[PDB]
Amino acid sequence: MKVEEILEKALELVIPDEEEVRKGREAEEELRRRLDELGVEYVFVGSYARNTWLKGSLEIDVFLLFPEEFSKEELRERGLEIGKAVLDSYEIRYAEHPYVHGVVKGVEVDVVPCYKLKEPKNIKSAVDRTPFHHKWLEGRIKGKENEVRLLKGFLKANGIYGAEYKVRGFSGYLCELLIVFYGSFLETVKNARRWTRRTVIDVAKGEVRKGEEFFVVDPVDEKRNVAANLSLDNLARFVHLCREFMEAPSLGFFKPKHPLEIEPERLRKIVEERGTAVFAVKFRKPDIVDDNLYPQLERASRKIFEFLERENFMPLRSAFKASEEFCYLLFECQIKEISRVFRRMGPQFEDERNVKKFLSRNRAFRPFIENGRWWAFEMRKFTTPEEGVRSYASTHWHTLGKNVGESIREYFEIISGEKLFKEPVTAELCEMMGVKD
Amino acid sequence: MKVEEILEKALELVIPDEEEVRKGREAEEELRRRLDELGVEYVFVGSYARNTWLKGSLEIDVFLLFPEEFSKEELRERGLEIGKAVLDSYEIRYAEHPYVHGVVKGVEVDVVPCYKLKEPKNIKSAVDRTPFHHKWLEGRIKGKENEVRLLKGFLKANGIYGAEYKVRGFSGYLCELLIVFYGSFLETVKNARRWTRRTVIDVAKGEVRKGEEFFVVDPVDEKRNVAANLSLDNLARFVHLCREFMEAPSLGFFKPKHPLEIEPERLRKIVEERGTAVFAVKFRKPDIVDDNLYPQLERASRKIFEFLERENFMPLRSAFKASEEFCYLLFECQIKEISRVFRRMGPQFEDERNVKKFLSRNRAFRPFIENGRWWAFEMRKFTTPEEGVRSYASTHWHTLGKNVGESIREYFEIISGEKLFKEPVTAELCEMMGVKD
Ligand SMILES: [Mn+2]
Ligand SMILES: [Mn+2]
Ligand SMILES: [Mn+2]
Ligand SMILES: [Mn+2]
Ligand code: NA
Ligand code: NA
């Protein structure tokens, strides 16, 4: 309905509501009042400070700015003493070093100790870049705050906003960089139609060029890829979404898709038509944070996938899901049942000693020569992909992630058929099979 | 029971019987009387002339020796005019050029026109080497005639005597060369335990060395591999049989194996236990000679084998059989049924035009991105190896040998299960699956 008018409407899906802005205003006035009362040097950073934050994602970040001659333990103790005193409630989470993540008057706050520094090239972590991120962006992003939100909003409605490992999408900083680079949401989208897996966006040089991987060069530090956590597949998806948008623009690109919620009977039909084996490994969710869990689920599900390939069950795709209590590793394979008999490779006919060993083993059928080499018929211990994985998970849990493996060691189940539809996995199965609306 | 005594007993399985020797004597006296009466220059060649021939394989070869100044058509006409006049019954078969293959007093004779030549390096075909083969071997093989028979006999009882393509084993000439080289049957066997696929036996140099393939150098012509038609797998088998013989010698190595002749019920059990798909392609045998048929059956059966591999039915082995009326191509596959759905590869996400084409095709499920590339779920047209081959043989018969293909084009059948056991293939199936006695 004309791009200019669709963007206007999306601004209402994207700009946070009234009581949200003023909920942040008073948590920002309370927090100032507490820190000011204590004499701490501080700075508000992140997207709240710049009025670029998405509707629904209100977060205040405050960095404590402590003189360059403070030790690595003295800043770690003192910095958290102020975080106790300033927050309604406090805890010590870790991004790399400890930092207080709590609440003030109903609003998430992160308090972070870090060196007071003028000029970068004098920093230690991802934490010490942040004040410089903010400084670099403040003023350049003025007038363009709504563009950022439109971009964050576009990404979020399509499941690719957030650099955390559950998402492996676009961070807020990345979105603000992009807007500074291209000028607007719409120019970002138009230009991203030509991005490749080798595109280097060098923001500080005003330059796009080719290199080895997708890389957005941090204007604060030229060694840092701001898009380091963006996965290749989400880059691909973004590029394609940008092409689709410019081809037939629509408000629905800023709305989440009315989900599938199909009933067991359609799924039964679909599975029957496809003629695959569909099953899940179920086990108890380890009590670790997301950024630790999701890489483990990815590795577990990859390991089982490779086992199934190697064992000739021809896996099509796999997926994984964490619920409150359980995790699920989900698979679909082209082979529902393989023969009991298989070929085991023996030695070249020349190698007398080793042929003798190969021929010693008692078997039910006679070995044979083919293309100059011995081979023997031997028997598999499992004939379905479900039995295979029972066996693999029982024996090779050690390879399925530190905590994922240890949980599976304690308890796991293979689920197929009508039982698989009693678990909260239907949505994931549908997506994994490309089920249409 | 001691090697020396086993060899003595085998000599009775190997040296032709009494009425066989004198059946050849009188066919050799009749034939001389006919050619002598006509004034033809001739020479008896082959293993009859040297008393090296196996029990059961009585064959007289006579080569007509015509002056060096005879044309290539004048020797072809005249040479066959004498073959009509000398044989009870005559026909013109082809090894490379025409030659009369008929009978005299109940005995196969080949009459062959060829140039009368002193010194080789003045020859045209495999035919002109033969007189020189005989000349080179006559005198060197005296006293060792029984050794040759023992060797021919050992090879024949194990299915590897004959260079013709149904066998791809050891020719008579090769066996006589081997005996001259090593001196005896037993030294041939002892030394062949060390043969490799790279062994060069250079008879005229009294030398064994390494080269690129198994090669027995013709003492008459150094470019000629006397073992050219020996297959790698039969070489392998011979080597292994020679090892087994020296390890536990026995008369039974000169006897054929009391065959399996298993009944349908055991085969049903075995197939059930193995859990494979076992089937055959049946069709009418083309009316061509063996050396033409068997390479075609090998190619047809290889082509279907590769189709089944490529289509993920995981073929274990294949075999083929010609009966009087039908041929059979036999297969065993690990996959009895595959899913209807499969992954079709699309383009890299970057390639806008080609992604658009890939995404245009109407399908039942949505395509998806994985590792930077598009993929689509699509549907197979067959889900069992039997259906696959119905389809392949109906469409790609042209690739299955000139005559084999044309017959299959006219009529073929896929046979499975109880029907497969109504055909004369059981012995071949058993061997292909390594069924034990
Ligand atoms: Mn924060
Ligand atoms: Mn940075
Ligand atoms: Mn002959
Ligand atoms: Mn020769
Ligand atoms: Na196991
Ligand atoms: Na076809």
Please give the CATH topology (third level) of the domain spanning A16-143. Answer: Beta Polymerase; domain 2 (3.30.460)
Q: How far apart are CA A150 and CA A55, in angstroms?
A: 10
Cα–ligand 3 centroid distance for A429 (angstroms): 71
The minimal CB distance from A237 to the residues B312, B369, B433 is found for: B369
Min distance B199 CA to chain A CA atoms (Å): 11
Cα–ligand 1 centroid distance for A46 (angstroms): 7
Domain extent listing, chain B:
1-15+144-259, 16-143, 260-339+384-437, 340-383
Taking a contact as any Cβ pair under 8 Å apart, which residues of chain B between 186 and 215 contact chain A? 193, 196-197
Which residue pairs from B128-132 have beta carbons closer than 8 angstroms and sit at least 24 positions apart in sequence?
B129/B218, B129/B220, B129/B221, B129/B224, B130/B45, B130/B46, B130/B61, B130/B63, B131/B43, B131/B45, B131/B63, B131/B65, B132/B220, B132/B221
Q: Architecture of domain A1-15+144-259 in CATH?
A: Orthogonal Bundle (1.10)
The minimal CB distance from B372 to the residues A197, A275, A314 is found for: A197
φ and ψ of B5, to 5 deg: -90, -30
Q: Which residues of B touch A243 (CB under 8 A)?
A: 352
Please tell me the CATH code under which domain B260-339+384-437 is placed: 3.30.70.590
Strand partners, B379: B341
Cβ within 8 Å, pair A436-B364: yes
A302: contact with B, CB 8 A cutoff: no
Q: Which ligand is nearest to the CA of A134?
A: 2
- Could you tell me the two tokens for B94? 């082809």
Burial class (CB in 10 A: 0-12, 13-18, 19+), B351: middle
Cα–Cα nearest to A243, from A314, A190, A289, A185: A190
Please give the CATH topology (third level) of the domain spanning A340-383. Answer: Alpha-Beta Plaits (3.30.70)
Residues 6+ apart with CB under 8 A from A188: A147, A151, A178, A179, A181, A182
Are A260-339+384-437 and A340-383 equal in CATH topology?
yes
Cα–Cα nearest to B109, from B91, B132, B127: B91
- Could you tell me the two tokens for A97? 């070093």
Taking each helix axis from N to C end, the angle separating B130-137 and B172-182, rounded to the nearest 10 degrees, works out to 30
CA dihedral B271→B272→B276→B277, nearest 10 degrees, is: 80
In this structure, is the dihedral angle defined by the CA atoms of residues A198, A203, A204 and A205, taken in order, positive or negative? positive
Q: How far apart are CA A48 and CA B25, in angstroms?
A: 114
Q: Which ligand is nearest to the CA of A173?
A: 2
The minimal CB distance from A233 to the residues B275, B352, B372 is found for: B372
Taking each helix axis from N to C end, the angle separating A74-86 and A18-38, rounded to the nearest 10 degrees, works out to 120
Cβ within 8 Å, pair B342-A334: yes
Q: Which residues of A touch B352 (CB under 8 A)?
A: 193, 243
φ and ψ of B131, to 5 deg: -55, -35
CB pairs under 8 A between A and B: 140
Cβ within 8 Å, pair B335-A338: yes
Q: How far apart are CA A194 and CA A243, in angstroms?
A: 9
Q: Which residues in chain A precede a discontinuity of more than 2.5 Å between C and N? A: none
Taking a contact as any Cβ pair under 8 Å apart, which residues of chain B between 74 and 103 contact chain A? none
| Phi-psi map region of B380: left, alpha, beta (phi>0 left; psi -120 to 50 alpha) | beta
Q: What's the maximum distance between 2 C-alpha atoms anywhere in chain B?
A: 89
Q: Which residues in chain B precede a discontinuity of more than 2.5 Å between C and N? A: none
Taking a contact as any Cβ pair under 8 Å apart, which residues of chain B between 375 and 414 contact chain A? 377, 383
Cα–ligand 4 centroid distance for A341 (angstroms): 46
| Phi-psi map region of A139: left, alpha, beta (phi>0 left; psi -120 to 50 alpha) | left
Q: How far apart are CA B303 and CA B301, in angstroms?
A: 6
Min distance B189 CA to chain A CA atoms (Å): 15
DSSP letter (8 states) at residue A87 = -
- Could you tell me the two tokens for A125? 């972590």
Question: Residue B94: helix, strand or coil by DSSP?
Answer: strand
Q: How far apart are CA A362 and CA A345, in angstroms?
A: 15
Q: How far apart are CA A108 and CA A57, in angstroms?
A: 9
Cα–ligand 3 centroid distance for B166 (angstroms): 17
φ and ψ of A45, to 5 deg: -130, -170
Q: Which residues of A touch B262 (CB under 8 A)?
A: none
Q: Which of A335, A358, A360 to mutate to test the interface with B (most CBs of B within 10 A)?
A: A335
Kindly provide the resolution of this structure in angstroms, with one decimal.
2.1
Q: Which residues of A touch B232 (CB under 8 A)?
A: 371-372
CA angle at residue B150 from B144 to B156, to 5 degrees? 140
Helix (H) or strand (E) holding A305: helix A290-310
Single-letter residue type at A400: L
DSSP string of B284-351? Answer: EPPS--HHHHHHHHHHHHHHHHHHHHHTT--EEEEEEEE-SSEEEEEEEES-S---SEEEEEEEETT-
Q: What is the CA radius of gyration of chain A?
A: 28
